[PDB]
Amino acid sequence: LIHFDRNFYQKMKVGVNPRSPGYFIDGLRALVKLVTAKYQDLQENQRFVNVGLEKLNESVKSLTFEKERWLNTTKQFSKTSQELIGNCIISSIYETYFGHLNERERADMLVILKRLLGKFAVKYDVNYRFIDYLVTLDEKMKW
Amino acid sequence: AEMQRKREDLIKLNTEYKLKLKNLEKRLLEELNNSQGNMLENDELMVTLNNLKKEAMNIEKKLSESEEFFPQFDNLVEE
C-alpha cells in the first residue's frame, strides 16, 4: 500500500509536489471493512456446504455418491480464501484511488498494483473483475 | 466474432449457473426437509439434479476452455 501510494502520485499527478496522504488512510479503512465482510461470507458458504455434508451422510440412489463429488468444493474453499486478502487490496484501491481515473489510467495503475502483489507474498485471483467481485447481480441489474 | 460472442456469455453463464447452482441447492434442501417423512418426492428434483450433472460440470467445461480463452484474449488486446 505504501509502495502503491508512492507510485500513484508519481505516475498520475502533475503540478508541483503540493499534495499528500489522504487516499492512503481511506484505502486502509476500506480494506478492513471489506476483509471482515468477506470472511463473514466465506464462513457462511462453508457453513452451507458443512450442512449439506451432514445431510448426505445421513442418507447413506445411483447419483448420491457423486454428490460427495459435488462435495469436493470442500477442498476448493481453502485456495479461494488464500486469495481473498489480496483481492480485497485491489477492491479497496479501486474504491479509493480509481474513481477519478481514465479507462487507460485505471488499467495502467492496475498493472503496477498487480505486479506489486506479484512480488509480495500475497495471492490474488488471476481472473479478477472489480464489477463481478463487489456487485451483486441483483444490484447490477437494478442500476 | 466467435470469441467476442463467447466472452460475454462466459462471465454471464459463470454467474448464471452459479446462481442456478445455489438456486437448485436451496430447492433440494427445502424439499429434503419437507418430504423426509413424506413420499420419495426428492426424486422429482433428483432428475433435475441429474440435469445438474451437465450444469455443475458445464462450469468445469467452461473453466477448462477459460484457461485457453483468457490468454488468447489478452494476446488480441495488444494488436
GROMACS .gro file of C-alpha atoms in nm:
model
  222
    1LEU     CA    1   0.000   0.000   0.000
    2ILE     CA    2   0.290   0.234   0.075
    3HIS     CA    3   0.459   0.131  -0.250
    4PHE     CA    4   0.127   0.186  -0.430
    5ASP     CA    5   0.058   0.535  -0.289
    6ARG     CA    6   0.419   0.633  -0.371
    7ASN     CA    7   0.359   0.511  -0.728
    8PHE     CA    8   0.015   0.667  -0.768
    9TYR     CA    9   0.122   1.030  -0.716
   10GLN     CA   10   0.447   0.963  -0.908
   11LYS     CA   11   0.265   0.837  -1.218
   12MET     CA   12  -0.074   1.018  -1.218
   13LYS     CA   13  -0.043   1.373  -1.076
   14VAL     CA   14   0.125   1.681  -1.226
   15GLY     CA   15   0.152   2.026  -1.062
   16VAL     CA   16   0.442   2.077  -0.825
   17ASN     CA   17   0.469   1.843  -0.529
   18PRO     CA   18   0.192   2.012  -0.326
   19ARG     CA   19  -0.028   1.720  -0.222
   20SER     CA   20  -0.003   1.428   0.029
   21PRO     CA   21  -0.151   1.116   0.203
   22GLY     CA   22  -0.523   1.110   0.239
   23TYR     CA   23  -0.621   0.831  -0.001
   24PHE     CA   24  -0.382   0.603   0.187
   25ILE     CA   25  -0.597   0.636   0.502
   26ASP     CA   26  -0.928   0.571   0.321
   27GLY     CA   27  -0.767   0.280   0.134
   28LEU     CA   28  -0.668   0.109   0.457
   29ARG     CA   29  -1.008   0.173   0.617
   30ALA     CA   30  -1.181   0.018   0.315
   31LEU     CA   31  -0.968  -0.300   0.326
   32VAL     CA   32  -1.052  -0.372   0.692
   33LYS     CA   33  -1.425  -0.309   0.621
   34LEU     CA   34  -1.408  -0.541   0.318
   35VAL     CA   35  -1.198  -0.830   0.460
   36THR     CA   36  -1.436  -0.854   0.761
   37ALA     CA   37  -1.730  -0.857   0.521
   38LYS     CA   38  -1.560  -1.127   0.302
   39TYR     CA   39  -1.453  -1.351   0.590
   40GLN     CA   40  -1.813  -1.349   0.722
   41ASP     CA   41  -1.938  -1.451   0.374
   42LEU     CA   42  -1.677  -1.722   0.316
   43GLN     CA   43  -1.757  -1.877   0.658
   44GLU     CA   44  -2.127  -1.855   0.559
   45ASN     CA   45  -2.080  -2.056   0.237
   46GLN     CA   46  -1.855  -2.301   0.421
   47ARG     CA   47  -2.135  -2.345   0.675
   48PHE     CA   48  -2.374  -2.400   0.380
   49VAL     CA   49  -2.157  -2.690   0.249
   50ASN     CA   50  -2.099  -2.834   0.600
   51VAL     CA   51  -2.479  -2.861   0.649
   52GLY     CA   52  -2.506  -3.040   0.311
   53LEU     CA   53  -2.224  -3.278   0.411
   54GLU     CA   54  -2.418  -3.394   0.717
   55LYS     CA   55  -2.737  -3.427   0.508
   56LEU     CA   56  -2.579  -3.667   0.255
   57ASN     CA   57  -2.406  -3.880   0.522
   58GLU     CA   58  -2.745  -3.932   0.691
   59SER     CA   59  -2.888  -4.078   0.364
   60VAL     CA   60  -2.601  -4.330   0.304
   61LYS     CA   61  -2.951  -4.385  -0.518
   62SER     CA   62  -2.704  -4.420  -0.807
   63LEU     CA   63  -2.625  -4.047  -0.824
   64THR     CA   64  -2.591  -3.969  -0.449
   65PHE     CA   65  -2.227  -4.098  -0.436
   66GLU     CA   66  -2.127  -3.819  -0.681
   67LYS     CA   67  -2.266  -3.558  -0.454
   68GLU     CA   68  -1.981  -3.649  -0.237
   69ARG     CA   69  -1.809  -3.550  -0.566
   70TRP     CA   70  -2.015  -3.231  -0.564
   71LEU     CA   71  -1.873  -3.217  -0.211
   72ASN     CA   72  -1.513  -3.164  -0.342
   73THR     CA   73  -1.571  -2.794  -0.347
   74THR     CA   74  -1.471  -2.875   0.014
   75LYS     CA   75  -1.105  -2.879  -0.089
   76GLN     CA   76  -1.162  -2.574  -0.314
   77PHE     CA   77  -1.251  -2.335  -0.029
   78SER     CA   78  -0.905  -2.313   0.128
   79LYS     CA   79  -0.750  -2.198  -0.201
   80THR     CA   80  -1.033  -1.944  -0.250
   81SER     CA   81  -0.973  -1.800   0.098
   82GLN     CA   82  -0.598  -1.757   0.047
   83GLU     CA   83  -0.657  -1.509  -0.233
   84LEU     CA   84  -0.936  -1.305  -0.061
   85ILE     CA   85  -0.688  -1.090   0.135
   86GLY     CA   86  -0.504  -0.971  -0.177
   87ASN     CA   87  -0.836  -0.949  -0.365
   88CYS     CA   88  -0.961  -0.703  -0.108
   89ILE     CA   89  -0.644  -0.496  -0.158
   90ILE     CA   90  -0.736  -0.437  -0.528
   91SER     CA   91  -1.100  -0.374  -0.443
   92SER     CA   92  -1.010  -0.109  -0.184
   93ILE     CA   93  -0.767   0.064  -0.414
   94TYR     CA   94  -1.036   0.078  -0.691
   95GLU     CA   95  -1.283   0.227  -0.441
   96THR     CA   96  -1.033   0.483  -0.322
   97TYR     CA   97  -0.778   0.575  -0.592
   98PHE     CA   98  -0.954   0.489  -0.921
   99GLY     CA   99  -1.275   0.694  -0.909
  100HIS     CA  100  -1.126   0.988  -1.099
  101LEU     CA  101  -0.903   0.800  -1.345
  102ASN     CA  102  -0.942   0.739  -1.726
  103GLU     CA  103  -1.007   0.395  -1.887
  104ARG     CA  104  -0.639   0.379  -1.976
  105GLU     CA  105  -0.533   0.541  -1.646
  106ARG     CA  106  -0.716   0.273  -1.446
  107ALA     CA  107  -0.582  -0.031  -1.631
  108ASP     CA  108  -0.230   0.112  -1.619
  109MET     CA  109  -0.229   0.154  -1.242
  110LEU     CA  110  -0.389  -0.189  -1.201
  111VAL     CA  111  -0.075  -0.337  -1.371
  112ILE     CA  112   0.157  -0.162  -1.126
  113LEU     CA  113  -0.063  -0.283  -0.839
  114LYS     CA  114  -0.079  -0.642  -0.970
  115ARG     CA  115   0.299  -0.664  -1.018
  116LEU     CA  116   0.341  -0.526  -0.665
  117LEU     CA  117   0.102  -0.801  -0.549
  118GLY     CA  118   0.316  -1.040  -0.757
  119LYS     CA  119   0.643  -0.961  -0.583
  120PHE     CA  120   0.495  -0.970  -0.232
  121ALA     CA  121   0.382  -1.295  -0.078
  122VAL     CA  122   0.008  -1.244  -0.139
  123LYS     CA  123  -0.208  -1.450  -0.375
  124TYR     CA  124  -0.466  -1.285  -0.596
  125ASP     CA  125  -0.733  -1.412  -0.834
  126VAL     CA  126  -0.586  -1.429  -1.184
  127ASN     CA  127  -0.931  -1.391  -1.341
  128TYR     CA  128  -1.036  -1.081  -1.146
  129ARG     CA  129  -1.306  -0.830  -1.231
  130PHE     CA  130  -1.395  -0.543  -0.996
  131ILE     CA  131  -1.757  -0.529  -1.111
  132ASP     CA  132  -1.826  -0.904  -1.063
  133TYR     CA  133  -1.631  -0.907  -0.731
  134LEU     CA  134  -1.823  -0.646  -0.535
  135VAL     CA  135  -2.151  -0.607  -0.721
  136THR     CA  136  -2.437  -0.846  -0.674
  137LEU     CA  137  -2.628  -0.945  -0.987
  138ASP     CA  138  -2.945  -0.800  -0.830
  139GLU     CA  139  -2.776  -0.456  -0.783
  140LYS     CA  140  -2.611  -0.472  -1.124
  141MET     CA  141  -2.948  -0.519  -1.294
  142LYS     CA  142  -3.109  -0.252  -1.075
  143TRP     CA  143  -2.858   0.020  -1.175
  144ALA     CA  144  -1.680  -1.270  -3.388
  145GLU     CA  145  -1.686  -1.615  -3.228
  146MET     CA  146  -1.460  -1.524  -2.933
  147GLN     CA  147  -1.619  -1.184  -2.869
  148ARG     CA  148  -1.958  -1.363  -2.866
  149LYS     CA  149  -1.832  -1.622  -2.619
  150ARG     CA  150  -1.668  -1.360  -2.397
  151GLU     CA  151  -1.995  -1.209  -2.275
  152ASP     CA  152  -2.165  -1.546  -2.207
  153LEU     CA  153  -1.851  -1.682  -2.037
  154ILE     CA  154  -1.880  -1.444  -1.738
  155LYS     CA  155  -2.265  -1.446  -1.778
  156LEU     CA  156  -2.302  -1.831  -1.755
  157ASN     CA  157  -2.033  -1.829  -1.484
  158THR     CA  158  -2.263  -1.620  -1.262
  159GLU     CA  159  -2.594  -1.762  -1.404
  160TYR     CA  160  -2.502  -2.130  -1.347
  161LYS     CA  161  -2.361  -2.042  -1.003
  162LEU     CA  162  -2.687  -1.855  -0.927
  163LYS     CA  163  -2.872  -2.165  -1.052
  164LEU     CA  164  -2.632  -2.389  -0.856
  165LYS     CA  165  -2.722  -2.203  -0.540
  166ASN     CA  166  -3.088  -2.183  -0.655
  167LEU     CA  167  -3.108  -2.562  -0.704
  168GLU     CA  168  -2.917  -2.636  -0.378
  169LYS     CA  169  -3.189  -2.440  -0.197
  170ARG     CA  170  -3.468  -2.627  -0.390
  171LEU     CA  171  -3.305  -2.957  -0.289
  172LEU     CA  172  -3.258  -2.885   0.083
  173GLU     CA  173  -3.605  -2.734   0.130
  174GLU     CA  174  -3.777  -3.042  -0.018
  175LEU     CA  175  -3.545  -3.279   0.173
  176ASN     CA  176  -3.680  -3.119   0.498
  177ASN     CA  177  -4.044  -3.119   0.377
  178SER     CA  178  -4.051  -3.466   0.219
  179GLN     CA  179  -3.841  -3.666   0.473
  180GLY     CA  180  -4.140  -3.838   0.639
  181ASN     CA  181  -4.345  -3.791   0.321
  182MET     CA  182  -4.303  -3.975  -0.014
  183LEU     CA  183  -4.000  -4.000  -0.244
  184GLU     CA  184  -4.062  -3.654  -0.398
  185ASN     CA  185  -3.694  -3.559  -0.378
  186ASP     CA  186  -3.665  -3.797  -0.681
  187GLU     CA  187  -3.862  -3.547  -0.892
  188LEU     CA  188  -3.592  -3.293  -0.808
  189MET     CA  189  -3.320  -3.559  -0.844
  190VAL     CA  190  -3.398  -3.587  -1.217
  191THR     CA  191  -3.348  -3.207  -1.220
  192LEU     CA  192  -3.031  -3.284  -1.019
  193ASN     CA  193  -2.948  -3.533  -1.296
  194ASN     CA  194  -2.979  -3.235  -1.530
  195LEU     CA  195  -2.743  -3.057  -1.285
  196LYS     CA  196  -2.472  -3.316  -1.372
  197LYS     CA  197  -2.446  -3.123  -1.701
  198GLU     CA  198  -2.470  -2.789  -1.513
  199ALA     CA  199  -2.215  -2.849  -1.236
  200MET     CA  200  -1.976  -2.995  -1.492
  201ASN     CA  201  -2.074  -2.733  -1.754
  202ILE     CA  202  -1.890  -2.495  -1.521
  203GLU     CA  203  -1.595  -2.732  -1.534
  204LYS     CA  204  -1.640  -2.748  -1.916
  205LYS     CA  205  -1.626  -2.366  -1.930
  206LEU     CA  206  -1.340  -2.330  -1.679
  207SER     CA  207  -1.128  -2.571  -1.889
  208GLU     CA  208  -1.180  -2.359  -2.202
  209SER     CA  209  -1.126  -2.039  -1.998
  210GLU     CA  210  -0.764  -2.131  -1.930
  211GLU     CA  211  -0.744  -2.143  -2.309
  212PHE     CA  212  -0.960  -1.832  -2.387
  213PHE     CA  213  -0.822  -1.564  -2.150
  214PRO     CA  214  -0.456  -1.579  -2.257
  215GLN     CA  215  -0.578  -1.560  -2.626
  216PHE     CA  216  -0.796  -1.257  -2.544
  217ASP     CA  217  -0.504  -1.081  -2.374
  218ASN     CA  218  -0.291  -1.155  -2.679
  219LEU     CA  219  -0.553  -0.987  -2.901
  220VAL     CA  220  -0.561  -0.674  -2.687
  221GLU     CA  221  -0.210  -0.574  -2.792
  222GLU     CA  222  -0.258  -0.564  -3.172
   0.00000   0.00000   0.00000
